[PDB]
Amino acid sequence: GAMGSMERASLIQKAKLAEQAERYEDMAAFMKGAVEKGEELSCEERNLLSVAYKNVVGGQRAAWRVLSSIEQKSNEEGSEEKGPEVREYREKVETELQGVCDTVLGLLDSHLIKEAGDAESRVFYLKMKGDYYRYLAEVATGDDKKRIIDSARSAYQEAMDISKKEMPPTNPIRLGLALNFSVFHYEIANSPEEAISLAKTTFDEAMADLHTLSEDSYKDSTLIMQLLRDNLTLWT
Amino acid sequence: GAMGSMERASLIQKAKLAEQAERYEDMAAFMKGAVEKGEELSCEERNLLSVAYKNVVGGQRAAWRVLSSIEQKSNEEGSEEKGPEVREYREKVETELQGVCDTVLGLLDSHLIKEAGDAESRVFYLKMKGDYYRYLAEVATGDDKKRIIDSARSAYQEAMDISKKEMPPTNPIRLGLALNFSVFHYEIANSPEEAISLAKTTFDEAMADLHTLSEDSYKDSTLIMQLLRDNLTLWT
Amino acid sequence: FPATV
Amino acid sequence: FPATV
Ligand SMILES: CC(C)(Oc1ccc(Br)cc1)C(=O)Nc1cccc(-c2csc(C(=N)N)c2)c1
Ligand SMILES: CC(C)(Oc1ccc(Br)cc1)C(=O)Nc1cccc(-c2csc(C(=N)N)c2)c1
Ligand SMILES: [Mg+2]
Ligand SMILES: [Mg+2]
Ligand SMILES: [Mg+2]
Ligand SMILES: [Mg+2]
Ligand SMILES: [Mg+2]
Ligand SMILES: [Mg+2]
Structure with a gap:
């Protein structure tokens, strides 16, 4: 690790500076270095890690979608040919996106999840695991696509089971997990009815707990x- | 060059795809590879090169300014201390910015400028040379700062001399050169009166040629x- | 696209 | 900042 010589506290400080400067690739590299120090992450540190990689992969996903759209049009009737370049460049971006997802999943597996015992940490990390498998599933097309989808589902389901037992229905981590698992059902698992049911039940149970x-x-x-309501409005 | 094995036309095509995907670092790398094929650049290709690097360095400059501001506040009265991290990270971003500027200046010197004979190409490249020396001057503080400023001035002045002899006063390259040289005078050379005079004379001479x-x-x-008027409004 | 966090 | 192109 190129961050092995930098103090943990300095890596966290520089991650915060990178965020202020909108340098999310640097932010993610600093947070990866912090994770690799081997200590558990505090609540703030977990959110720095997630913010950094969400921004990096979100930019990659947006670029992949643009390129995939161009590639799709190139392969329609009427288009004659423009060579391998669109596919090649879409593949380049795709491979870089997969590398980032694999990096995040690797941090979760070595060893953030296994040391996370409190619900707020464990649910957070399992949600991340579902999210990064979901991003892999968005670009998957091969022999392993079904297994990638099932890896996302399994992580989200373990997070859901813990969240329902250990957190109130208004806990923002529980809500964000449900939001994203609902999107998984709609966009990845071809299960719009499950997506809508999950979003509605989550919203209604949260509503009833706001008074506390x-x-x-x-x-x-x-x-x-x-956000749950926004998705329900989009889907109904 | 990691682009040495890719066809020139494929590099240009992928630069355009990278732009559509807002992947400006990739765009710049593809255009650097295209320049390194050794052929002169067409008008469109020159603008792809400039768009790519302007976006990369513009992001670096914005980040450098954020970090420099934080660093300045840290070194005021009242702040006790927060360690070397802000300076270190500002220096990291600064070094990366300088590297990009040096790369662009290297492409101009090897060998875009020396092969550029038409005014539209030569003025364009000399403007770029002034711009990238200006970006170096924005972060310079050492024994070479005055020489960096003078390198920017000299490039802009050669471009200006050619533009006034060989282009009409409404030519957009001539106008953009004047815009940026005026900003150089205001922000780099501590010459606000020269900046204002140049912007005003450029605007008025262009106005008089619009009828053609x-x-x-x-x-x-x-x-x-x-844009000239916007700067004049800012400065007066 | 739908909202995620 | 002032405008440049
Ligand atoms: C997007 C939003 C509003 O809500 C959710 C809700 C559920 C999940 Br799962 C994820 C996000 C959020 O970011 N909440 C949040 C919650 C706790 C801590 C921080 C934080 C500390 S530091 C820091 C930083 N950006 N430097 C951010 C931020
Ligand atoms: C910013 C704006 C409006 O004006 C100026 C004016 C002077 C200078 Br010096 C620089 C910019 C500009 O970009 N003009 C312009 C002029 C000629 C060609 C292209 C072009 C071809 S391809 C491409 C692309 N982005 N794929 C862009 C763009
Ligand atoms: Mg230590
Ligand atoms: Mg692939
Ligand atoms: Mg249920
Ligand atoms: Mg060839
Ligand atoms: Mg320095
Ligand atoms: Mg004059």
Whole structure:
């Protein structure tokens, strides 16, 4: 690791600076170095890790979608030919995206998940595992596609089971997990009815628990509830 | 060069795809590979090169400014100390920015400028040379700072001399050169009066030549004229 | 696309 | 910042 010589605290400090500078690739590299120090991550540190990689992979996904669209049109009737370049460049971006997902999954497997005992950490990491397998599934087409989808499903399901037993229905991690697992059902697993049912039940159970919350917790929970409603509006 | 095995035409095609995907680092790498094939660049290709590196370095400059601001505040009265990390990370970004500028300047020196005989190519490349020395000057602080500033000035001045002899006052390259040289005077050379005079004279001479233009040329020229006016409004 | 966090 | 192109 090129970060092996830098102090853990300095890596965390520089991750925060990289975020301020919108340098998310650097942010992710600093957080990878912090994880590789081998200590568990605090709540703030877990969110720095997730923010960094979500931004990196989100940019890769957007680029992959642009290139895949161009590639699809190139292979329609009417287009004569423009050579291998579109496929090659889509493949280049795809391979880089897969590499980032594999890196994140590797950090989760070595050894963040196995040391995570509290619900807030364990659910968070298992949600991430489902998310990064979902991003792999978005680009998958080969012998392993079904296994990639099932790896995402399995991680999300373990996170869901823990979240329902150990967190209140308004916990923002529980809400965000449900939001994303619902998107998995809709976009990956060809299960729109499960996606809609999960989003609706999550929203309604959260609504009923808002009365227990402070103003600040209410703000956090209702923010994610509005995303659930936004998706329900899109899908119905 | 990692692009040495790819066809020139494929590099240009992939640069255009990278632009569509907002992958400007890739765009710049493809265009560097195209330049290194050793052939002169067409008008479109010159603009692909400039767009790619302008976007890369523009992001680096924005990040450098954020980090420099944080560093400045850290070194004020009242701040106690937060260690070497802010300086180190500002230095990291700075070194990467300098590397990109050196790469562009190297392409111009080997061998784009020396083969550029037409005004539209030669002025374009000399403007770029002034721009990338200007970006080096923005971060310079050492024994060579004055020489970096003078390198920018010299390139801009040669471009200006050619542009006034060989291009009409509405030519968008001539206008953009004047815009940027005016910014050099204001922000780098501590010469706000020269910046304002250059912007005003450029605008007025362009205004007087608009009557010769087609609707499409008029649109291109007035776009850059409005940037000159925007800067004049900022500075007066 | 749908919202995820 | 001022405009450049
Ligand atoms: C997007 C949003 C609003 O909600 C969710 C909800 C569920 C999940 Br699962 C993920 C995100 C969020 O980011 N919440 C959040 C919650 C706890 C800590 C931080 C944080 C500490 S530091 C830091 C930083 N960006 N430097 C961010 C941020
Ligand atoms: C910013 C703007 C409006 O004006 C100026 C004016 C002076 C200078 Br010096 C620089 C820019 C510009 O970009 N003009 C322009 C002029 C000629 C060609 C292209 C082009 C071909 S291809 C391509 C692409 N982006 N794929 C872009 C673009
Ligand atoms: Mg230590
Ligand atoms: Mg592939
Ligand atoms: Mg159920
Ligand atoms: Mg060839
Ligand atoms: Mg330095
Ligand atoms: Mg003069």
